[PDB]
Amino acid sequence: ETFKALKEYRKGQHNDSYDEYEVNQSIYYPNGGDARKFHSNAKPRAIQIIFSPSVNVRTIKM
Amino acid sequence: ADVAGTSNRDFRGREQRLFNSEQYNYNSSLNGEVSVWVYAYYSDGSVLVINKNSQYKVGISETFKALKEYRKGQHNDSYDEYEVNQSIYYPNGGDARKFHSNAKPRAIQIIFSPSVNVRTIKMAKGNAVSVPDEYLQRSHPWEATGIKYRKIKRDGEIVGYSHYFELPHEYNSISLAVSGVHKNPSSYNVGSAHNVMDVFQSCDLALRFCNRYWAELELVNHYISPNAYPYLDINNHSYGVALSNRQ
Amino acid sequence: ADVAGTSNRDFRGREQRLFNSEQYNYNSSLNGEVSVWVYAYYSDGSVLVINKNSQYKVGISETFKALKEYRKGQHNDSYDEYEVNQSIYYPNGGDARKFHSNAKPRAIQIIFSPSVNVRTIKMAKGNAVSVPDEYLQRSHPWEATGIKYRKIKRDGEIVGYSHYFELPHEYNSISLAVSGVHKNPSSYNVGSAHNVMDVFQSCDLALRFCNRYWAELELVNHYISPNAYPYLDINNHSYGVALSNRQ
Amino acid sequence: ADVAGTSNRDFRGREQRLFNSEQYNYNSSLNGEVSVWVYAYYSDGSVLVINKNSQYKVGISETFKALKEYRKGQHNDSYDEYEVNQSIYYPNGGDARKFHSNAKPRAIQIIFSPSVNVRTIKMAKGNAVSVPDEYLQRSHPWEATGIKYRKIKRDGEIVGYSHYFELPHEYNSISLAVSGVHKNPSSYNVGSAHNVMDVFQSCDLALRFCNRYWAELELVNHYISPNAYPYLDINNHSYGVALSNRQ
Ligand SMILES: Nc1nc2c(ncn2[C@@H]2O[C@H](COP(=O)(O)OP(=O)(O)OP(=O)(O)O)[C@@H](O)[C@H]2O)c(=O)[nH]1
Ligand SMILES: Nc1nc2c(ncn2[C@@H]2O[C@H](COP(=O)(O)OP(=O)(O)OP(=O)(O)O)[C@@H](O)[C@H]2O)c(=O)[nH]1
Ligand SMILES: Nc1nc2c(ncn2[C@@H]2O[C@H](COP(=O)(O)OP(=O)(O)OP(=O)(O)O)[C@@H](O)[C@H]2O)c(=O)[nH]1
Ligand SMILES: Nc1ncnc2c1ncn2[C@@H]1O[C@H](COP(=O)(O)OP(=O)(O)OP(=O)(O)O)[C@@H](O)[C@H]1O
Ligand SMILES: Nc1ncnc2c1ncn2[C@@H]1O[C@H](COP(=O)(O)OP(=O)(O)OP(=O)(O)O)[C@@H](O)[C@H]1O
Ligand SMILES: Nc1ncnc2c1ncn2[C@@H]1O[C@H](COP(=O)(O)OP(=O)(O)OP(=O)(O)O)[C@@H](O)[C@H]1O
Ligand SMILES: Nc1ccn([C@@H]2O[C@H](COP(=O)(O)OP(=O)(O)OP(=O)(O)O)[C@@H](O)[C@H]2O)c(=O)n1
Ligand SMILES: Nc1ccn([C@@H]2O[C@H](COP(=O)(O)OP(=O)(O)OP(=O)(O)O)[C@@H](O)[C@H]2O)c(=O)n1
Ligand SMILES: Nc1ccn([C@@H]2O[C@H](COP(=O)(O)OP(=O)(O)OP(=O)(O)O)[C@@H](O)[C@H]2O)c(=O)n1
Ligand SMILES: Nc1ccn([C@@H]2O[C@H](COP(=O)(O)OP(=O)(O)OP(=O)(O)O)[C@@H](O)[C@H]2O)c(=O)n1
Ligand SMILES: [Cl-]
Ligand SMILES: [Cl-]
Ligand SMILES: [Cl-]
Ligand SMILES: [Mg+2]
Ligand SMILES: [Mg+2]
Ligand SMILES: [Mg+2]
Ligand SMILES: [Mg+2]
Ligand SMILES: [Mg+2]
Ligand SMILES: [Mg+2]
Ligand SMILES: [Mg+2]
């Protein structure tokens, strides 16, 4: 998944989509965008990766 | 004329120093302002400041709601944020579509001007329904929190006082009032019969400011620094201007 | 150990009773809260509550407008309700599309906590333009209405005071302020020189709450009962918790 | 110590040169990335880039639709652009209100990193319904277009490969997939039994990027240059950083 695809998207509700385009331009390059926020709350705060017990843990790659 | 910076007759230097010292000591006379700021920090990096400036005593009181992020001119999920509030006022009382409102403050910094007597500072830190200590019946209307206030320092000088508390837990749902009394080292009570009605007029004359800034950098650059206010940023850096006996 | 509920040595029972009595009497000491609620009832079954909690004295003041129903996050005919207000402030002064705003309160209940002295209660019940008695010139700024306050009772105990008045007529268009002083049976004046500045700080430290609940049942279930507030519902039933000398 | 820039003992210089050469040769080892970019140029000056970065082999596949300009957060005539698509998929199949969608790409540049073997490059340049050569039955799924790829050069060094084709005619309506294999001068097949499952994992591990930049200048300034990517702008200027044996 891309940086964008991981950001919160609320189906059927408002998502500041124009400003969140601006936000992305400023994450892809310092001062590259014209957002109205310092931090997008749409950005993930944490990630958990889980595998099933059928995986060989020594084969996991990130 | 004597050369600059070489004698007791640099009258420009002596006036500069008196000009700064006069402003330090006027602030702290009974003629001067006492000022309080409450900063509500939101998870989006923005900062609501509420400032009140007034003579003798000053305070700020705000409801749980009034402290939540409000973005002027932009969408604020206002219907859902009504639902959200009903669920904060009573467990499972609302019908929101979120677990945590990002409009809720993550931290609060209370700052006072150096004209306050830190021993007079009182905080009413209530629950979401504006009750200081769980039930009204056993609530002392305030706590004297002055002992927790750190000195904001610049150049060896106290430029103000800071109390900072995070609200990082889901139950950190608050209403907030805070009060301080202007320094009075004299035995002239500013609220005794002779001057009490001037204090009632200071209640009316207290000037208020609030605004949401987009970032702490914007607060530092455009709120704090232009006005010579004290501040303590997230990295523990002190902002202010030391005035007492300096040029 | 002695068996529970059979001796003078049930120390769990004695502590329970002291715990409740301590909260009754702390409320009513000069250290405790005095609280006022104004309930605006709307024709749609909803109820605006405004609560203020503070030491020594407490009050609420609201304009004609601030008392009108406002539905957060939903449509409120705001343009027409501007027009409506102009016609309430002066006969035929506006251009509304309704005869009666359903946003206008149908009734008001004023409740005080049992820490109030009912003889200190004062009401400024103004006209729509905030004039207590027809013209400012002959207006006494208040009326001492304490004699009309019924005791809210639970188990033989006063859990608060209620004044209720309907606004069912087309001309019942009001602004409203109400004030009460915390019980002081002592001859220590809380606003004499020794303690006057603490009273000025209680003005700042007074905590406020308001919210519109959808129904009286929701007020009873989720505002009144969770917080141990007194209430008197439309069917004349008293809500509260009797604390003095009980388990 | 020896003076800088005068001897075989400038170890800072030798390390700088090794640091750059190590990055050139790591890219081109079987451990390194191979990267493809497709740039869709629109008549409004904007540029969609789709980048994929992965080990062993890399490619991008996009439908006719996915290549059309989409302006995040702004209006895109989406209903009419549905109608537009129906008329591109079949002559006179839709009910649009335009002859030519300005959302259609005017040109495409395909760039590969210098870790590709140009002889392994394959393009499936289909019609609007995703058929490479008029009908599926006589379609070879790809063309080996490597011979058309120009070297992007900086300082004498190949910083990547470019194939550029305009789409300036009304019938230049395309779907597009493009594929390249990482350089392997060895006789160790990266997809033989010993390493085949790592190649299946590189399919999952391939990282993707896309974004629409407002202008080629913004692509050059904020996409290409910050990341040390190769580029060839409209004026035939080569961008990249020469690394092999330089400081
Ligand atoms: N006091 C002091 N300041 C120094 C020294 N070295 C650099 N400084 C800088 O000089 C600034 C203040 O110097 P001055 O104002 O001229 O000295 P002062 O201590 O205020 O004494 P007076 O101005 O004569 O009353 C400080 O904020 C420092 O950043 C030093 O050794 N002593
Ligand atoms: N006082 C009283 N309560 C009764 C009686 N019958 C039923 N009750 C119930 O019992 C409740 C209170 O009883 P208790 O608290 O045990 O008695 P008390 O009058 O408070 O006396 P103490 O607890 O010993 O101080 C009331 O609220 C009633 O609902 C009765 O005959 N007398
Ligand atoms: N090679 C070369 N570069 C020149 C000359 N004149 C100016 N330059 C500039 O110098 C740059 C590279 O010079 P150097 O890197 O010091 O020389 P080099 O050819 O890389 O040789 P080494 O660094 O010793 O391995 C070029 O990109 C030119 O812009 C010249 O006559 N020969
Ligand atoms: N190098 C120095 N040696 C002695 N005194 C100094 C020196 N630098 C500054 N001072 C003086 O010592 C006093 C304290 O100044 P200083 O700037 O160190 O404190 P501050 O601004 O409150 O805290 P900080 O520098 O730790 O952020 C002032 O009178 C200042 O002019
Ligand atoms: N059956 C009873 N006989 C005698 N005393 C009772 C009885 N029931 C309750 N009491 C006691 O008499 C006092 C009055 O209690 P009670 O519940 O009747 O008043 P209340 O709650 O203020 O009013 P109400 O019951 O009319 O709504 C309390 O001490 C209570 O414990
Ligand atoms: N004036 C020069 N004389 C000789 N060699 C040079 C000169 N300038 C640069 N070089 C060297 O010759 C080689 C080719 O460098 P050059 O910059 O001319 O090629 P380029 O960047 O691929 O193409 P271009 O300059 O035409 O855009 C490099 O080793 C470079 O350092
Ligand atoms: N930096 C920004 C951010 C927003 N906007 C304006 O904000 C308006 C509405 O906000 P938007 O970012 O589009 O989000 P919403 O409309 O609130 O919700 P949604 O994601 O559904 O569009 C847009 O018309 C856009 O022009 C702007 O001019 N400049
Ligand atoms: N629990 C909720 C939350 C929201 N909504 C619907 O969400 C719609 C729009 O969301 P809203 O909460 O009103 O916020 P926005 O419209 O996105 O922005 P604003 O604060 O300006 O209204 C409203 O019509 C409301 O009916 C709802 O039905 N139930
Ligand atoms: N006497 C009136 C009353 C209403 N309107 C028109 O009614 C329209 C919409 O009604 P409004 O009073 O604004 O209420 P709503 O839009 O229904 O809801 P809200 O309070 O959110 O605006 C407004 O544009 C206003 O121009 C009017 O022209 N004259
Ligand atoms: N051939 C077409 C094209 C457009 N429309 C009407 O055009 C209206 C608005 O244009 P639309 O194509 O939806 O684009 P926009 O609304 O301008 O922008 P967006 O892509 O955000 O919807 C739509 O309601 C659609 O019914 C139509 O009836 N027939
Ligand atoms: Cl003074
Ligand atoms: Cl007391
Ligand atoms: Cl290798
Ligand atoms: Mg929707
Ligand atoms: Mg707006
Ligand atoms: Mg310093
Ligand atoms: Mg709404
Ligand atoms: Mg009873
Ligand atoms: Mg938008
Ligand atoms: Mg060159």
PDB file of C-alpha atoms in Angstrom, chain C residues 56-127:
ATOM      1  CA  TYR C  56     -20.208  31.599  47.697  1.00  0.00           C
ATOM      2  CA  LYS C  57     -22.747  32.726  45.088  1.00  0.00           C
ATOM      3  CA  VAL C  58     -23.868  31.533  41.693  1.00  0.00           C
ATOM      4  CA  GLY C  59     -26.031  32.832  38.822  1.00  0.00           C
ATOM      5  CA  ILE C  60     -27.040  32.457  35.155  1.00  0.00           C
ATOM      6  CA  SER C  61     -27.916  35.308  32.741  1.00  0.00           C
ATOM      7  CA  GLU C  62     -29.251  34.681  29.261  1.00  0.00           C
ATOM      8  CA  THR C  63     -30.725  36.865  26.507  1.00  0.00           C
ATOM      9  CA  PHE C  64     -34.105  36.159  24.827  1.00  0.00           C
ATOM     10  CA  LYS C  65     -32.185  34.674  21.890  1.00  0.00           C
ATOM     11  CA  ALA C  66     -29.803  32.460  23.912  1.00  0.00           C
ATOM     12  CA  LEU C  67     -32.862  30.757  25.473  1.00  0.00           C
ATOM     13  CA  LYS C  68     -34.336  29.791  22.088  1.00  0.00           C
ATOM     14  CA  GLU C  69     -33.966  26.229  20.882  1.00  0.00           C
ATOM     15  CA  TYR C  70     -30.832  25.644  18.901  1.00  0.00           C
ATOM     16  CA  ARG C  71     -30.336  22.220  17.331  1.00  0.00           C
ATOM     17  CA  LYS C  72     -26.646  21.545  16.907  1.00  0.00           C
ATOM     18  CA  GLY C  73     -25.816  20.011  13.556  1.00  0.00           C
ATOM     19  CA  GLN C  74     -29.318  20.378  12.163  1.00  0.00           C
ATOM     20  CA  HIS C  75     -31.295  23.059  10.337  1.00  0.00           C
ATOM     21  CA  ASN C  76     -32.688  25.903  12.542  1.00  0.00           C
ATOM     22  CA  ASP C  77     -34.451  28.321  10.113  1.00  0.00           C
ATOM     23  CA  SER C  78     -31.741  30.748  11.173  1.00  0.00           C
ATOM     24  CA  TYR C  79     -32.570  33.513   8.669  1.00  0.00           C
ATOM     25  CA  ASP C  80     -36.301  33.385   9.461  1.00  0.00           C
ATOM     26  CA  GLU C  81     -35.433  33.160  13.194  1.00  0.00           C
ATOM     27  CA  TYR C  82     -33.513  36.417  12.807  1.00  0.00           C
ATOM     28  CA  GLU C  83     -36.716  37.829  11.270  1.00  0.00           C
ATOM     29  CA  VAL C  84     -38.706  36.299  14.129  1.00  0.00           C
ATOM     30  CA  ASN C  85     -36.517  37.971  16.761  1.00  0.00           C
ATOM     31  CA  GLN C  86     -36.985  41.406  15.115  1.00  0.00           C
ATOM     32  CA  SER C  87     -40.757  40.988  15.456  1.00  0.00           C
ATOM     33  CA  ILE C  88     -40.474  39.905  19.163  1.00  0.00           C
ATOM     34  CA  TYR C  89     -38.147  42.915  19.980  1.00  0.00           C
ATOM     35  CA  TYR C  90     -40.689  45.257  18.456  1.00  0.00           C
ATOM     36  CA  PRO C  91     -44.304  44.551  17.341  1.00  0.00           C
ATOM     37  CA  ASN C  92     -44.347  44.064  13.517  1.00  0.00           C
ATOM     38  CA  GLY C  93     -40.577  44.792  13.368  1.00  0.00           C
ATOM     39  CA  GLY C  94     -39.670  41.742  11.360  1.00  0.00           C
ATOM     40  CA  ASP C  95     -40.548  39.819   8.227  1.00  0.00           C
ATOM     41  CA  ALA C  96     -40.957  36.236   9.520  1.00  0.00           C
ATOM     42  CA  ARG C  97     -42.977  33.395   7.890  1.00  0.00           C
ATOM     43  CA  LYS C  98     -44.425  32.151  11.176  1.00  0.00           C
ATOM     44  CA  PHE C  99     -46.727  33.431  13.869  1.00  0.00           C
ATOM     45  CA  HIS C 100     -45.014  31.517  16.713  1.00  0.00           C
ATOM     46  CA  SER C 101     -41.455  30.199  16.781  1.00  0.00           C
ATOM     47  CA  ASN C 102     -41.392  26.689  18.149  1.00  0.00           C
ATOM     48  CA  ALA C 103     -37.840  27.634  19.227  1.00  0.00           C
ATOM     49  CA  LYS C 104     -39.374  29.811  22.005  1.00  0.00           C
ATOM     50  CA  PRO C 105     -39.432  28.258  25.491  1.00  0.00           C
ATOM     51  CA  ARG C 106     -42.830  27.009  26.726  1.00  0.00           C
ATOM     52  CA  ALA C 107     -41.763  26.876  30.373  1.00  0.00           C
ATOM     53  CA  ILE C 108     -38.819  27.528  32.630  1.00  0.00           C
ATOM     54  CA  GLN C 109     -37.797  25.630  35.764  1.00  0.00           C
ATOM     55  CA  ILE C 110     -35.173  27.261  38.011  1.00  0.00           C
ATOM     56  CA  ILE C 111     -33.575  24.845  40.455  1.00  0.00           C
ATOM     57  CA  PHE C 112     -31.077  25.549  43.151  1.00  0.00           C
ATOM     58  CA  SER C 113     -28.940  23.135  45.194  1.00  0.00           C
ATOM     59  CA  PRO C 114     -29.684  22.681  48.900  1.00  0.00           C
ATOM     60  CA  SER C 115     -26.568  24.805  49.723  1.00  0.00           C
ATOM     61  CA  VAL C 116     -28.500  27.994  48.709  1.00  0.00           C
ATOM     62  CA  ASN C 117     -30.262  30.273  51.151  1.00  0.00           C
ATOM     63  CA  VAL C 118     -33.660  30.622  49.522  1.00  0.00           C
ATOM     64  CA  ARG C 119     -34.032  34.165  50.943  1.00  0.00           C
ATOM     65  CA  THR C 120     -31.062  35.279  48.852  1.00  0.00           C
ATOM     66  CA  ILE C 121     -32.615  34.211  45.499  1.00  0.00           C
ATOM     67  CA  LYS C 122     -33.184  37.051  43.002  1.00  0.00           C
ATOM     68  CA  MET C 123     -34.646  36.946  39.474  1.00  0.00           C
ATOM     69  CA  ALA C 124     -34.313  39.464  36.680  1.00  0.00           C
ATOM     70  CA  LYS C 125     -37.121  38.275  34.372  1.00  0.00           C
ATOM     71  CA  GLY C 126     -36.965  40.793  31.562  1.00  0.00           C
ATOM     72  CA  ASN C 127     -38.849  41.505  28.346  1.00  0.00           C
TER      73      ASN C 127
END
